[PDB]
Design a protein around this motif. Structure first.
Motif, PDB file in Angstrom:
ATOM      1  N   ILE B  52     176.969  72.966  49.162  1.00  0.00           N
ATOM      2  CA  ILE B  52     177.259  74.210  49.862  1.00  0.00           C
ATOM      3  C   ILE B  52     175.997  74.763  50.502  1.00  0.00           C
ATOM      4  O   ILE B  52     176.058  75.381  51.567  1.00  0.00           O
ATOM      5  N   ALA B  53     174.832  74.537  49.891  1.00  0.00           N
ATOM      6  CA  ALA B  53     173.594  74.964  50.535  1.00  0.00           C
ATOM      7  C   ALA B  53     173.391  74.237  51.857  1.00  0.00           C
ATOM      8  O   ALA B  53     173.119  74.862  52.893  1.00  0.00           O
ATOM      9  N   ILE B  54     173.532  72.908  51.845  1.00  0.00           N
ATOM     10  CA  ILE B  54     173.349  72.147  53.078  1.00  0.00           C
ATOM     11  C   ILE B  54     174.362  72.580  54.124  1.00  0.00           C
ATOM     12  O   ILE B  54     174.018  72.787  55.292  1.00  0.00           O
ATOM     13  N   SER B  55     175.623  72.739  53.725  1.00  0.00           N
ATOM     14  CA  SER B  55     176.644  73.131  54.687  1.00  0.00           C
ATOM     15  C   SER B  55     176.363  74.510  55.267  1.00  0.00           C
ATOM     16  O   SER B  55     176.496  74.720  56.477  1.00  0.00           O
ATOM     17  N   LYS B  56     175.970  75.466  54.424  1.00  0.00           N
ATOM     18  CA  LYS B  56     175.727  76.816  54.912  1.00  0.00           C
ATOM     19  C   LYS B  56     174.576  76.841  55.903  1.00  0.00           C
ATOM     20  O   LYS B  56     174.649  77.526  56.929  1.00  0.00           O
ATOM     21  N   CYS B  57     173.515  76.089  55.634  1.00  0.00           N
ATOM     22  CA  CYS B  57     172.360  76.124  56.521  1.00  0.00           C
ATOM     23  C   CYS B  57     172.452  75.132  57.671  1.00  0.00           C
ATOM     24  O   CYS B  57     171.586  75.142  58.549  1.00  0.00           O
ATOM     25  N   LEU B  58     173.478  74.290  57.695  1.00  0.00           N
ATOM     26  CA  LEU B  58     173.585  73.217  58.673  1.00  0.00           C
ATOM     27  C   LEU B  58     174.158  73.672  60.006  1.00  0.00           C
ATOM     28  O   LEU B  58     173.896  73.046  61.034  1.00  0.00           O
ATOM     29  N   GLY B  59     174.924  74.754  60.022  1.00  0.00           N
ATOM     30  CA  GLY B  59     175.590  75.186  61.230  1.00  0.00           C
ATOM     31  C   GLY B  59     176.783  74.303  61.532  1.00  0.00           C
ATOM     32  O   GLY B  59     177.090  73.350  60.818  1.00  0.00           O
ATOM     33  N   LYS B  60     177.473  74.633  62.618  1.00  0.00           N
ATOM     34  CA  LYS B  60     178.653  73.868  63.020  1.00  0.00           C
ATOM     35  C   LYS B  60     178.313  72.786  64.039  1.00  0.00           C
ATOM     36  O   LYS B  60     178.977  72.652  65.062  1.00  0.00           O
ATOM     37  N   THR B  61     177.283  72.009  63.772  1.00  0.00           N
ATOM     38  CA  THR B  61     176.965  70.928  64.697  1.00  0.00           C
ATOM     39  C   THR B  61     176.777  69.581  64.020  1.00  0.00           C
ATOM     40  O   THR B  61     177.198  68.562  64.570  1.00  0.00           O
ATOM     41  N   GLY B  62     176.165  69.549  62.836  1.00  0.00           N
ATOM     42  CA  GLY B  62     175.715  68.322  62.222  1.00  0.00           C
ATOM     43  C   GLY B  62     176.612  67.839  61.094  1.00  0.00           C
ATOM     44  O   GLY B  62     177.675  68.388  60.817  1.00  0.00           O
ATOM     45  N   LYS B  63     176.149  66.776  60.436  1.00  0.00           N
ATOM     46  CA  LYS B  63     176.922  66.142  59.379  1.00  0.00           C
ATOM     47  C   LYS B  63     176.055  65.887  58.160  1.00  0.00           C
ATOM     48  O   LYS B  63     174.863  65.596  58.283  1.00  0.00           O
ATOM     49  N   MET B  64     176.664  65.994  56.984  1.00  0.00           N
ATOM     50  CA  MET B  64     176.002  65.728  55.717  1.00  0.00           C
ATOM     51  C   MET B  64     176.769  64.677  54.927  1.00  0.00           C
ATOM     52  O   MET B  64     177.992  64.747  54.779  1.00  0.00           O
ATOM     53  N   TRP B  65     176.035  63.683  54.438  1.00  0.00           N
ATOM     54  CA  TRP B  65     176.578  62.629  53.601  1.00  0.00           C
ATOM     55  C   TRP B  65     175.983  62.751  52.213  1.00  0.00           C
ATOM     56  O   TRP B  65     174.754  62.790  52.055  1.00  0.00           O
ATOM     57  N   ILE B  66     176.865  62.834  51.223  1.00  0.00           N
ATOM     58  CA  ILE B  66     176.512  62.803  49.814  1.00  0.00           C
ATOM     59  C   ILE B  66     176.623  61.367  49.342  1.00  0.00           C
ATOM     60  O   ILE B  66     177.671  60.735  49.508  1.00  0.00           O
ATOM     61  N   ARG B  67     175.557  60.848  48.748  1.00  0.00           N
ATOM     62  CA  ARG B  67     175.546  59.452  48.338  1.00  0.00           C
ATOM     63  C   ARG B  67     175.942  59.252  46.885  1.00  0.00           C
ATOM     64  O   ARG B  67     176.668  58.308  46.576  1.00  0.00           O
ATOM     65  N   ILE B  68     175.499  60.112  45.996  1.00  0.00           N
ATOM     66  CA  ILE B  68     175.809  59.994  44.577  1.00  0.00           C
ATOM     67  C   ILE B  68     177.150  60.647  44.294  1.00  0.00           C
ATOM     68  O   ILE B  68     177.707  61.371  45.123  1.00  0.00           O
ATOM     69  N   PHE B  69     177.674  60.386  43.101  1.00  0.00           N
ATOM     70  CA  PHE B  69     178.981  60.856  42.703  1.00  0.00           C
ATOM     71  C   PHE B  69     179.037  60.914  41.185  1.00  0.00           C
ATOM     72  O   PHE B  69     178.532  60.004  40.515  1.00  0.00           O
ATOM     73  N   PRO B  70     179.637  61.948  40.617  1.00  0.00           N
ATOM     74  CA  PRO B  70     179.678  62.053  39.146  1.00  0.00           C
ATOM     75  C   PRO B  70     180.717  61.129  38.529  1.00  0.00           C
ATOM     76  O   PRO B  70     181.756  61.545  38.026  1.00  0.00           O
ATOM     77  N   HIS B  71     180.425  59.828  38.562  1.00  0.00           N
ATOM     78  CA  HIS B  71     181.340  58.854  37.981  1.00  0.00           C
ATOM     79  C   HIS B  71     181.487  59.063  36.486  1.00  0.00           C
ATOM     80  O   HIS B  71     182.597  58.994  35.951  1.00  0.00           O
ATOM     81  N   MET B  72     180.388  59.317  35.795  1.00  0.00           N
ATOM     82  CA  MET B  72     180.377  59.308  34.344  1.00  0.00           C
ATOM     83  C   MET B  72     180.717  60.680  33.785  1.00  0.00           C
ATOM     84  O   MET B  72     180.248  61.702  34.286  1.00  0.00           O
ATOM     85  N   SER B  73     181.537  60.695  32.742  1.00  0.00           N
ATOM     86  CA  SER B  73     181.832  61.915  32.017  1.00  0.00           C
ATOM     87  C   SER B  73     180.720  62.206  31.016  1.00  0.00           C
ATOM     88  O   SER B  73     179.671  61.562  31.011  1.00  0.00           O
ATOM     89  N   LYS B  74     180.957  63.187  30.150  1.00  0.00           N
ATOM     90  CA  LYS B  74     179.991  63.561  29.127  1.00  0.00           C
ATOM     91  C   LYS B  74     180.635  64.568  28.191  1.00  0.00           C
ATOM     92  O   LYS B  74     181.461  65.379  28.610  1.00  0.00           O
ATOM     93  N   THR B  75     180.234  64.523  26.927  1.00  0.00           N
ATOM     94  CA  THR B  75     180.866  65.313  25.884  1.00  0.00           C
ATOM     95  C   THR B  75     179.948  66.430  25.410  1.00  0.00           C
ATOM     96  O   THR B  75     178.758  66.465  25.722  1.00  0.00           O
ATOM     97  N   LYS B  76     180.531  67.349  24.649  1.00  0.00           N
ATOM     98  CA  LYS B  76     179.794  68.478  24.095  1.00  0.00           C
ATOM     99  C   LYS B  76     180.556  68.986  22.885  1.00  0.00           C
ATOM    100  O   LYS B  76     181.657  69.521  23.032  1.00  0.00           O
ATOM    101  N   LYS B  77     179.978  68.814  21.705  1.00  0.00           N
ATOM    102  CA  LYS B  77     180.619  69.260  20.480  1.00  0.00           C
ATOM    103  C   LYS B  77     180.797  70.775  20.514  1.00  0.00           C
ATOM    104  O   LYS B  77     179.880  71.495  20.922  1.00  0.00           O
ATOM    105  N   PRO B  78     181.956  71.293  20.105  1.00  0.00           N
ATOM    106  CA  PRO B  78     182.129  72.749  20.027  1.00  0.00           C
ATOM    107  C   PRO B  78     181.100  73.366  19.096  1.00  0.00           C
ATOM    108  O   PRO B  78     180.507  72.701  18.251  1.00  0.00           O
ATOM    109  N   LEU B  79     180.874  74.659  19.269  1.00  0.00           N
ATOM    110  CA  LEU B  79     179.761  75.331  18.615  1.00  0.00           C
ATOM    111  C   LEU B  79     180.109  75.701  17.175  1.00  0.00           C
ATOM    112  O   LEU B  79     181.270  75.680  16.762  1.00  0.00           O
ATOM    113  N   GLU B  80     179.074  76.072  16.428  1.00  0.00           N
ATOM    114  CA  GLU B  80     179.133  76.366  14.991  1.00  0.00           C
ATOM    115  C   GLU B  80     180.078  75.428  14.239  1.00  0.00           C
ATOM    116  O   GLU B  80     181.048  75.841  13.607  1.00  0.00           O
ATOM    117  N   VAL B  81     179.748  74.139  14.283  1.00  0.00           N
ATOM    118  CA  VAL B  81     180.477  73.127  13.529  1.00  0.00           C
ATOM    119  C   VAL B  81     179.490  72.158  12.895  1.00  0.00           C
ATOM    120  O   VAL B  81     178.471  71.810  13.498  1.00  0.00           O
TER     121      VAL B  81
END
Ligand SMILES: [Mg+2]
Ligand SMILES: [Mg+2]
Ligand SMILES: [Mg+2]
Ligand SMILES: [Mg+2]
Ligand SMILES: [Mg+2]
Ligand SMILES: [Zn+2]
Lengths: 112, 136, 175, 86, 50
Positions: B52-81
């Motif tokens: 969103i930063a790139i898009s906001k500062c890019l104006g309505k003329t150019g293009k942005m390509w994102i190369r990476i992607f969050p393929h991998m998940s990740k866990t988080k144990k609930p708190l006070e356990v």
RNA sequence: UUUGGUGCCCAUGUCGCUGUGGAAACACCUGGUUCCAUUUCGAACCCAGCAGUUAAGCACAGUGGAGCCGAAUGUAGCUGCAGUGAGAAUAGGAAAGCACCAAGC
RNA sequence: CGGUCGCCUCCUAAAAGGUAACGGAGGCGUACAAAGGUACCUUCAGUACGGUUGGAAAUCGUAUGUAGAGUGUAAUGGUGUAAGGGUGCUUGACUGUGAGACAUACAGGUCGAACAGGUGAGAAAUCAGGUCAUAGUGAUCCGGUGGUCCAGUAUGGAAUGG
RNA sequence: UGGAGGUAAAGCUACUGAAUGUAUGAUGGCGCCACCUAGGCGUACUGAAUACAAUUAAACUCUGAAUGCCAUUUAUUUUA
């Protein structure tokens, strides 16, 4: 689809695979090839993959009821004192001409 | 929010990013790209903020390509356990970013504007960024 | 026999029509099959026996019924429960049961005007469908509670469909 | 206070049968010894070796044991036994 | 468990030689094979025994 | 040496495209009355006959289309900063090869 | 409190084998007289063109394709002329054994050449001691059932044991 | 010295899931007119299938090491 001859080669491959896997003794295999015009035989000695003897209509014979390609090969092998072979119908069926060949081969001192 | 529609196995092994960027070594679609100099894990939320930063500062003329992607998940144990007695539920997705992966890249807009867009982007990401240009 | 006309004229005719100089580059008609698709045997309506008997009546070939090679829950046909029937007839039967159609049956159709403009496969085959088996002479009025048609094919020994045009035109088929 | 957890549902596994290779190359073996233990024919039986219905590669005569490459992309492995100079 | 097994016995000497498995629920027929019998020293018809 | 058979090899052996040849052979082919056979049928299996065929199979020459194979350098990992060395990518090869047997040579 | 308590397959398990956790996924407490054994024959699913009932999709012939099909079932491994589909004949889903190995604390488990008896399939070689492989199961004691070239508290039997 | 293996790494038009862009655009949805059914029009969009470029993986593999391992050769040593 198939050409009636590649298919026969395939049946022969099946048979030779069984033989080459099963032949615990060094028995010489007796391959017969059946052609529409006449017939031929050769005796492949496996474990060395050379040929020992052979026969065909082209031993100055006629067009193959010509079991004569049995008596002569029986003679040639018994002169090599092996006389314990295993039969190989190529891809053919053990019937008709092939049977008339095999029985003649048996009744002249072979053991198979 | 970038997120795989559905994954096979919900709780996988964490992937160490200590390498030299298998794949995505070089910029491949635009004139300028943003490179990392310390590998890390940037989640989907950080990719969203950078996009969103790139898009906001890019104006309505150019293009942005994102190369990476969050393929991998990740866990988080609930708190006070206490520990043990299972493995915690998956919480947030993350794109593994090795050192030297051109992750963002822009096109079709003046030079200085692209450099400014990339600087405005790389301040959201934790990885110490750098600016690279397309070869020729 | 229709084979008589073929082996009397057609070889020379199509040998001269196309510059071949090989007496058997001329297309040769190889087999004909008949199928009906008796699917009204959901479980047992008449268990296909009427179809078998009538197809035996039309052709000297003994009919054979095929078993389903699929599993379909939309009907009661899954992994078995043979449906339909099949004849593959040849020899004198191939040439003769052919003309017996074209000289007896098709004039007895509801409306026999023209076909074969687009029914070629494009590899040297052709098909004909019939909506009712009651039309053919080798049958009496009594039949199964339902009257069905037929699926017959002409397959030749050439892959270029214009050769099939030439062969079927040389044999006087309704185009 | 405490906290709510439980129901791992994944605390199960099986004994590991010790399948693999038992006679490497160069070994002198006598009839009846098992060369190779496997699930499915990861190694084919060549000459002078038999296959037991547990897909077990076991010898049938004395001789040196050799592995070999064959198959449509030279990726299948044969095992065989060679007789000595008898 | 399920007690699906069954026992075959020779008919000439009536010993209870053999043991096998048979699912009654499908093929209710009584098995009648012919196998080696140690007392009779030959292949004899064996039939099922309770 | 060329043709046919066949084992070993498993695509640098294929898949295909354009032509050339079939005396001896290999198939096609001609018939099904016989031995034998089709979930049905001389299609196939199996017999007994070679009038016609180079069409197709088979072989031979050319084909860099797909598929396949793939060097050196450099790099990534390694194991005590040198040796080890891939993968991918690339130039590029490639229209198979090894034997034994029967014929006319 | 909850969950689990044996057995089987993958990953974790660090390219031999092994290797823990209330670590990640899932199955079994069998099924088949044919889905066994043998001889013979045959080899994908799918897609495209073509065809009455008939439809996205039944079946029919044709090509195309190199396995995405099948393999009784969990996952893995292996298998396209096979270990897959059809047929004829049978019951080796034998008896008595067992050299030599595997993996193992013990108990147990696994594989198996070869030998004798008498068979099945096959022209014959050959194959067959259950299935493509890996789970599909539980000691001892006690008591019962069937057979018996075992004993029978002095003797003959029996009861009771073996 | 020969050999089993499928890791590190690499790769994904070499399959399985996930997945970025440009070109062709099907499946469709917004409208839309005829017609009451067989259907046409351009689709700011979802993207079948394919091509070209580029990606990720403990339970993905056309490929793939070194160390380690097994056995054997040669030299030396130890009687465990
Ligand atoms: Mg079977
Ligand atoms: Mg089974
Ligand atoms: Mg089983
Ligand atoms: Mg007494
Ligand atoms: Mg890796
Ligand atoms: Zn008895």
């Amino acid at each position: 689809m198939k050409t009636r001859t590649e298919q026969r080669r395939l049946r022969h491959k099946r048979i030779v695979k069984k033989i080459r896997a099963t032949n615990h003794d060094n028995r010489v295999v007796l391959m017969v090839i059946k052609s529409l015009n006449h017939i031929s035989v050769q005796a492949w000695d496996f474990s060395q993959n050379i040929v020992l003897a052979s026969s065909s209509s082209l031993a100055l014979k006629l067009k193959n009821n010509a079991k004569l390609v049995g008596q002569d090969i029986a003679d040639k092998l018994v002169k090599l004192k092996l006389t314990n072979v295993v039969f190989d119908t190529g891809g053919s069926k053990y019937h008709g001409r092939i049977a008339a060949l095999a029985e003649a081969a048996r009744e002249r001192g072979l053991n198979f | 929010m970038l997120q795989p529609k559905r994954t096979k196995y919900r709780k996988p092994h964490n992937v160490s990013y200590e390498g030299k960027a298998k794949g995505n070594s070089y910029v491949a679609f635009g004139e300028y790209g943003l490179v990392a100099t310390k590998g890390n894990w940037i989640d989907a939320r950080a990719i969203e903020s950078a996009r969103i930063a790139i898009s906001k500062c890019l104006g309505k003329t150019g293009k942005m390509w994102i190369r990476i992607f969050p393929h991998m998940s990740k866990t988080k144990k609930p708190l006070e356990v206490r520990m043990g007695s299972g493995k915690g539920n998956p919480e947030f997705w993350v794109a593994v970013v090795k050192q030297g992966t051109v992750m963002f890249e822009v096109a079709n807009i003046p030079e200085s504007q692209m450099i400014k867009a990339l600087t405005r982007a790389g301040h959201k990401l934790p990885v110490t960024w750098k600016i690279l240009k397309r070869e020729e | 026999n229709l084979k008589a006309h073929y082996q009397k004229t057609i070889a020379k005719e199509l040998q001269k029509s196309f510059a071949f100089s090989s007496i058997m580059q001329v297309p040769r008609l190889e087999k004909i099959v008949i199928n009906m698709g008796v699917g009204d045997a959901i479980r047992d309506s008449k268990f296909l026996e009427s179809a078998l008997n009538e197809l035996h009546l039309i052709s000297g070939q003994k009919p054979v019924a095929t078993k389903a090679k699929n599993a379909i829950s939309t009907y009661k046909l899954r992994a078995g429960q043979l449906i339909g029937c099949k004849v593959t007839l040849r020899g004198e039967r191939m040439w003769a049961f052919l003309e017996k159609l074209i000289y007896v049956a098709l004039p007895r159709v509801r409306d026999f005007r023209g076909l074969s403009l687009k029914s070629f496969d494009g590899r040297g085959n052709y098909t004909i469908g019939i909506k009712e088996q009651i039309i053919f002479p080798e049958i009496v009025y009594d039949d199964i509670k339902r009257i069905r048609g037929f699926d017959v094919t002409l397959v030749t020994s050439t892959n270029k469909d214009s050769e099939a045009l030439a062969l079927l035109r040389a044999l006087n088929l309704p185009l | 206070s405490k906290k709510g957890v439980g129901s791992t549902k994944n605390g199960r596994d099986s004994h590991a049968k010790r399948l693999g290779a038992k006679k490497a190359d160069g070994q002198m073996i006598r009839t009846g010894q098992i060369i190779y233990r496997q699930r499915g024919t990861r190694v084919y039986p060549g000459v002078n070796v038999g296959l037991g219905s547990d897909d077990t590669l076991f010898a049938l005569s004395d001789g040196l044991v050799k592995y070999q490459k064959f198959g449509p992309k030279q990726g299948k492995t044969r095992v065989s036994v060679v007789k000595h100079k008898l | 468990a399920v007690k699906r097994s069954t026992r075959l016995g020779c008919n000439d000497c009536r010993e209870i030689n053999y043991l096998t498995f048979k699912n009654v629920k499908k093929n209710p027929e009584k098995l009648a094979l012919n196998k080696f019998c140690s007392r009779c020293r030959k292949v004899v018809v064996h039939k099922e025994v309770k």
